[PDB]
Amino acid sequence: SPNYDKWEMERTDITMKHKLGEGQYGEVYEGVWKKYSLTVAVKTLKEDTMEVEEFLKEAAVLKEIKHPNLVQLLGVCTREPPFYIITEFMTYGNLLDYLRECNRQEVNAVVLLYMATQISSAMEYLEKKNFIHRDLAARNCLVGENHLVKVADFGLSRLMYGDTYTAHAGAKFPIKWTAPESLAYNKFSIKSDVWAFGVLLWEIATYGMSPYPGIDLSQVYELLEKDYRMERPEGCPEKVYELMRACWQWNPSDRPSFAEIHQAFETMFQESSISDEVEKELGKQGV
Structure with missing residues (x-):
């Protein structure tokens, strides 16, 4: 019944x-x-x-x-x-739309740690719910007028195909935006979702640029498995990048949980910037 x-x-x-x-x-x-x-x-x-x-x-x-x-x-x-x-529905719409529309008056660094710490707290809860988002992305996040970000999916294979979408590879995600572990093993866990989130933090960092746009699709598996990342965006804090690097670690054991990630954002929000590293491969906005 x-x-x-x-x-x-x-x-x-x-x-x-x-x-x-x-x-x-x-x-x-x-x-x-x-x-x-x-x-x-x-x-x-x-x-x-x-x-x-x-x-x-x-x-x-x-x-x-x-x-x-x-x-x-x-x-x-x-x-x-x-x-x-x-x-x-959150009034700004999806995160690609929000960040691109904020070419007008750009989202501040403080808002980045705020919005991203909301998503890290969100998924920390979601993992305990035994929920795997799998498609967790800027398109799969929404912003209210207060500049707060929330997790969601419409089911959007052709919503905004021009800024990103990749050819329907059988499964329910854009394969170019998808994890090397998820491509090879075909498994998703919180570990795979943390990588997705790492690319999402980067989408937040670059202020809604297209994910993996310069480099080729068949090459996307090859580079992601190697240890590749897009270069740190200009006018973005380094701290999000040193964290997203941990998310972009190939090995699941090296890669952290959302409880550890919120901790990473926690220190950032509290008056901090470039920490120790950032010797090379950080500067200009991705590709």
């Missing part, structure tokens, strides 16, 4: 403004209620979806992620005309 919760919401209540982009089961679009509300993202399954409603379980994962530093499920319409999942 189908079951629901406090998350049960009537579809008549939800008002749809415009389209954010596509998702896995179908498009994700921006909305709200009549008034006395805040901008929301609503994902749906297409009219041509089967009895395979496993979408409901994906909504249950959104229900599992409830935190102030995290995109949260506001509700689901299980009863009444077609099925909708309403999650919170």
